[PDB]
Amino acid sequence: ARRGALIVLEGVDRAGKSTQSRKLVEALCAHRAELLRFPERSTEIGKLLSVEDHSVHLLFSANRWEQVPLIKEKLSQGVTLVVDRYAFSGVAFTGAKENFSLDWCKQPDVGLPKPDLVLFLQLQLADAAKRGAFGHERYENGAFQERALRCFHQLMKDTTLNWKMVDASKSIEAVHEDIRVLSEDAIRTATEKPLGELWK
Amino acid sequence: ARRGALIVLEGVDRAGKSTQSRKLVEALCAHRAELLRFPERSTEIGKLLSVEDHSVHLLFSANRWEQVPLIKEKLSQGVTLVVDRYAFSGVAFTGAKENFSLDWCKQPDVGLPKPDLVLFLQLQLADAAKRGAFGHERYENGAFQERALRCFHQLMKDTTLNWKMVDASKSIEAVHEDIRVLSEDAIRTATEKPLGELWK
Ligand SMILES: Nc1ncnc2c1ncn2[C@@H]1O[C@H](COP(=O)(O)OP(=O)(O)O)[C@@H](O)[C@H]1O
Numbered sequence: 001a002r003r004g005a006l007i008v009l010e011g012v013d014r015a016g017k018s019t020q021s022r023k024l025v026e027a028l029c030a031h032r033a034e035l036l037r038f039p040e041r042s043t044e045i046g047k048l049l050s051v052e053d054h055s056v057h058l059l060f061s062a063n064r065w066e067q068v069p070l071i072k073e074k075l076s077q078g079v080t081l082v083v084d085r086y087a088f089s090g091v092a093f094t095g096a097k098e099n100f101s102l103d104w105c106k107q108p109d110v111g112l113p114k115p116d117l118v119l120f121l122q123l124q125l126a127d128a129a130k131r132g133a134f135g136h137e138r139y140e141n142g143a144f145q146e147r148a149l150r151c152f153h154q155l156m157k158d159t160t161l162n163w164k165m166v167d168a169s170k171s172i173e174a175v176h177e178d179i180r181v182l183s184e185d186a187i188r189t190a191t192e193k194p195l196g197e198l199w200k
Numbered sequence: 201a202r203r204g205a206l207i208v209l210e211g212v213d214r215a216g217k218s219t220q221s222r223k224l225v226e227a228l229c230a231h232r233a234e235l236l237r238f239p240e241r242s243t244e245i246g247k248l249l250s251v252e253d254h255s256v257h258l259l260f261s262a263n264r265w266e267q268v269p270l271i272k273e274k275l276s277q278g279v280t281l282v283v284d285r286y287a288f289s290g291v292a293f294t295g296a297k298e299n300f301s302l303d304w305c306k307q308p309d310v311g312l313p314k315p316d317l318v319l320f321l322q323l324q325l326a327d328a329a330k331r332g333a334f335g336h337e338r339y340e341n342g343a344f345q346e347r348a349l350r351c352f353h354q355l356m357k358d359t360t361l362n363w364k365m366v367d368a369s370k371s372i373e374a375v376h377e378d379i380r381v382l383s384e385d386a387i388r389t390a391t392e393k394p395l396g397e398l399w400k
């Protein structure tokens with residue numbers, strides 16, 4: 001009764017997370033795999049996120065926590081979950097707003113299902129800035145993006161998490177190939193041990 | 201331009217918090233004072249609280265955080281705020297559900313406006329159990345009430361907070377008299393220093 005893997009895709013805005021997450025799920029299914037995106041706008045907590053920045057940070061964490069019974073059930077059924085943004089983006093975005101410390105930002109997400117694999121989609125900030133995605137002012141805020149990346153860097157220092165850096169500057173097919181190999185390795189190997197808990 | 205005091209009334213279910221909070225505000229106004237109750241059911245976050253216990257805990261904290269701009273503005277205007285339950289009840293109730301540690305429960309409320317006075321309405325659990333208030337199953341859950349009290353006790357160990365224990369077993373008028381003297385002392389004295397931050 002082999003459990004599914006919990007795979008998280010992280011990285012700055014326009015790194016290719018939505019593109020690569022959908023590509024991964026569909027390729028795995030062509031294995032039992034499902035896609036999860038944070039924030040999940042469909043729930044009641046998600047509908048509130050559609051000001052007070054601490055409330056917003058907590059609402060983003062409560063949106064992750066409300067999906068925990070679903071996460072655990074799917075994983076126990078043998079379904080691998082591909083997650084487009086998790087607690088790491090939560091800490092990075094609030095940390096990019098800068099008013100609050102990394103320690104305060106991490107705390108609400110402490111205890112969440114620990115990912116078996118955290119894919120960090122790395123690319124130069126100037127490389128992501130020249131990408132075909134618009135619709136958010138924060139994309140053009142260079143300073144915000146630099147602070148968000150600094151937050152991601154500090155979070156990668158945690159030796160307990162299975163962080164795997166992927167060169168996100170490469171072609172759609174080459175980035176997919178790297179993500180596919182690492183994800184398949186996680187489904188076969190990382191699933192041997194029971195599902196852990198984030199930052200504890 | 202003397203700021204208002206932030207006064208919090210705490211204690212187990214049926215200690216007399218709703219009774220004493222309304223009595224205090226109206227007596228002070230007979231001074232500029234307003235009543236605040238947590239949870240505040242009128243807001244959007246409050247409307248969600250009207251399951252997943254971590255999400256609920258975070259929603260209760262986000263409900264406190266959304267009132268922070270209002271709290272700071274009222275206090276700066278010279279309005280004393282009388283608060284019926286705060287972060288202490290947040291930590292006590294989730295702690296009474298028991299699955300989570302006091303440290304995790306405290307973290308989301310870290311940074312909130314620090315009360316100038318925390319009134320703890322003490323009375324024997326058996327004294328509160330024989331009181332004229334019903335409508336909640338948790339009132340009859342003796343074990344839950346004992347754990348909630350244990351959580352309140354641990355929170356009172358914090359030497360940085362101005363905790364004042366009041367004998368809540370006494371008559372409505374005698375409990376009011378004690379709360380009135382301590383509240384008036386806080387309005388005159390505690391307001392000298394700037395508004396602090398909870399648990400930091
Ligand atoms: N390897 C790639 N090379 C160039 N553009 C890409 C690549 N992968 C994705 N994109 C494009 O970059 C933009 C952002 O991709 P997206 O998947 O939305 O990233 P994210 O979800 O990380 O913000 C989109 O316009 C997408 O089509």
Ligand SMILES: Nc1ncnc2c1ncn2[C@@H]1O[C@H](COP(=O)(O)OP(=O)(O)O)[C@@H](O)[C@H]1O
Nearest residue numbers: 213214215216217218219331332333370371372
């Ligand atoms: N000093 C008191 N002696 C006896 N009953 C009291 C006293 N103060 C309040 N009560 C009653 O006890 C019950 C709970 O009071 P309440 O203000 O709702 O407490 P809480 O808000 O702490 O749960 C009510 O029925 C109230 O009328």
Ligand SMILES: Cc1cn(C/C=C/CP(=O)(O)OP(=O)(O)O)c(=O)[nH]c1=O
Nearest residue numbers: 038039060085086089090091093094136
């Ligand atoms: C997880 C997570 C995400 N975001 C950023 C919020 C992103 C939601 P959007 O900007 O409306 O949509 P796209 O970034 O997908 O284009 C955040 O601020 N905190 C979080 O915990």
Ligand SMILES: Cc1cn(C/C=C/CP(=O)(O)OP(=O)(O)O)c(=O)[nH]c1=O
Nearest residue numbers: 238239260285286289290291293294336
């Ligand atoms: C602050 C706060 C309160 N409560 C308990 C929730 C109480 C709301 P009710 O039980 O519906 O109403 P009455 O207790 O006033 O009768 C909680 O669980 N967490 C908190 O942060």
Ligand SMILES: [Mg+2]
Nearest residue numbers: 017018019084
């Ligand atoms: Mg995306």
Ligand SMILES: [Mg+2]
Nearest residue numbers: 217218219284
């Ligand atoms: Mg009450």
